[PDB]
Design an enzyme around this catalytic site. Structure first.
Site, PDB file in Angstrom:
ATOM      1  CG  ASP A   8      33.913  40.268  17.339  1.00  0.00           C
ATOM      2  OD1 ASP A   8      33.995  39.069  17.710  1.00  0.00           O
ATOM      3  OD2 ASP A   8      33.389  41.161  18.044  1.00  0.00           O
ATOM      4  CE  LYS A  14      31.884  33.660  25.651  1.00  0.00           C
ATOM      5  NZ  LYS A  14      31.956  35.148  25.644  1.00  0.00           N
ATOM      6  CB  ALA A  21      29.649  39.963  20.846  1.00  0.00           C
ATOM      7  CG  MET A  42      34.036  40.438  27.832  1.00  0.00           C
ATOM      8  SD  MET A  42      32.744  39.199  28.030  1.00  0.00           S
ATOM      9  CE  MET A  42      33.364  37.872  26.974  1.00  0.00           C
ATOM     10  CG  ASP A  59      34.071  44.039  20.428  1.00  0.00           C
ATOM     11  OD1 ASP A  59      34.270  42.959  19.828  1.00  0.00           O
ATOM     12  OD2 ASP A  59      33.424  44.105  21.489  1.00  0.00           O
ATOM     13  CG  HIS A  95      34.382  35.119  31.808  1.00  0.00           C
ATOM     14  ND1 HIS A  95      34.249  36.080  30.829  1.00  0.00           N
ATOM     15  CD2 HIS A  95      33.916  35.681  32.949  1.00  0.00           C
ATOM     16  CE1 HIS A  95      33.724  37.173  31.354  1.00  0.00           C
ATOM     17  NE2 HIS A  95      33.513  36.957  32.640  1.00  0.00           N
ATOM     18  NE  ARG A 107      38.014  36.663  17.683  1.00  0.00           N
ATOM     19  CZ  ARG A 107      36.762  37.115  17.669  1.00  0.00           C
ATOM     20  NH1 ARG A 107      36.044  37.111  18.789  1.00  0.00           N
ATOM     21  NH2 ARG A 107      36.231  37.587  16.543  1.00  0.00           N
ATOM     22  CB  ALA A 134      30.644  40.714  35.262  1.00  0.00           C
TER      23      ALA A 134
HETATM   24 MG   LIG Z   1      33.803  40.587  20.461  1.00  0.00          MG
END
Ligand SMILES: [Mg+2]
Ligand SMILES: [Mg+2]
Lengths: 257, 257
Positions: free
Chosen positions: A8, A49, A10, A45, A182, A52, A156, A41
């Protein structure tokens, strides 16, 4: 047995603690007189987006304050304006977060020596990735392949992007590959794709800390936030969990038995 | 619980005995003074057509014979020319080989009534499938999706074509899909893709017989040839084998256990 590892971006490969998106969501609201906190915020996550943002909008504590400022509740129009703004700002500062997490580079080097192919998937759009990938390559990191939601029918947690990778890297079956992420979604995607799923902890979007606060936090305190996530992972499909990418080739050795 | 079945075309859903390609492969080699047998011609059936030709030249028996006749092993030019010929001959007869194998349509209809997706993969090019799939549709057979090697990095045995079918039908993981084919490459494609694999004997390329030959053959001799094909499909990865498509449903149920 394991011929490829899919990473992945980020909070795994770059952007320690994955703040870029966090940093932005906070700005679009702060500039509207409705300042939110890192917790709420980051709360969403994990989903589109666009959705989000709408999520934050429907967060009772934020919703009220919004109706206080604008004397009315958020409109589908507001969401659409805040989303357009989110991108523009993200593109602008994405380069400042594209640095390879200090551990990772050497690890990738080791895997490539073992003839193991390097793949990757992401939540960022192709536009964003172009920017992130460019800065990361200058800074020492460049996977053999990359895929974004744009390349597939859906991002995803679907396994599409993972199959695209296997296709391009030329590796099969799926259990000959490892997925490293992550976040919860990273785990879902890995399993849905039928591959070995692993989760990094230190620097994840789940542990939500920066390198700074990690190197300067109360051991006992930190050793506890690490579990609220390491456990969080296994509760989502992580055949394994690692505090750092330094434990990757070890898990591989295990798996291959 | 299964959610989709990926059917091969010739020898599996159409063209009983997969005869369309047969004489074209023998013809291309016969013009060069190098005779081959149907068995040889059929060995690589299911692979992308160009690969099938190259595979034929790879064969020792043929390579040696060619070397002896020409005083040098087959060349890329040779291959490329024979292929150009193979296509000319094939195209003018393909419409005559898109008839659905007798009881397959009842099966399909039954799968749909059970809410099961229908995908398909093949060795034919997209151009060839244009002719074949058109004629098949007029004769009542049309799966929900179709994939040729022209849509992926490579054809069989690689599982690429199966993944696209999965992406399109939105089915995961691969263990929720069953693959049905009539050749060895179809078997290796299923196991490579990580799905339930099945081989159909009567009408298969591997059995290499027409409907006449099967209905008018020494019963004892017949059951005996069925056994060789059967043993062959398994030997190459098949999870289960069936004589006709009427049995498929039953094997699915067994698996759902
Ligand atoms: Mg990530
Ligand atoms: Mg066939």
């Amino acid at each position: 047995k394991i011929e490829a590892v899919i990473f992945d971006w980020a909070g795994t490969t770059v952007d320690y603690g994955c703040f870029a998106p966090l940093e932005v969501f906070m700005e679009i609201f702060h500039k509207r007189g409705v300042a939110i906190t890192a917790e709420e915020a980051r709360k969403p996550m994990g989903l589109l987006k666009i959705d989000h943002v709408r999520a934050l909008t429907e967060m009772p504590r934020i919703a009220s304050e919004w109706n206080r400022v604008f004397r009315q509740l958020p409109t589908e129009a507001d969401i659409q304006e805040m989303y357009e703004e989110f991108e523009e700002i993200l593109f602008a500062i994405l380069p400042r977060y594209a640095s390879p997490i200090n551990a990772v580079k050497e690890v990738i080097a080791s895997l490539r020596e073992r003839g193991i192919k390097i793949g990757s998937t992401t939540g960022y759009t192709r536009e964003m990735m172009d920017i992130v990938a460019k800065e990361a390559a200058l800074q020492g990191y460049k996977p053999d392949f990359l895929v974004t939601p744009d390349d597939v029918p859906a991002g995803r947690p679907y396994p599409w992007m993972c199959y695209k990778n296997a296709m391009e890297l030329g590796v099969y079956p799926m259990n000959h590959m490892i997925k490293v992420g992550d976040t919860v979604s990273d785990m879902k995607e890995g399993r849905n794709a039928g591959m070995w799923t692993v989760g990094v902890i230190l620097g994840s979007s789940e542990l939500g800390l920066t390198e700074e606060e990690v190197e300067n936090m109360d051991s006992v305190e930190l050793r506890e936030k690490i579990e609220v996530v390491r456990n969080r992972f296994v509760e989502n499909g992580a055949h394994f969990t690692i505090e750092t990418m330094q434990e990757l080739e070890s898990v591989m050795e295990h798996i291959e038995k």
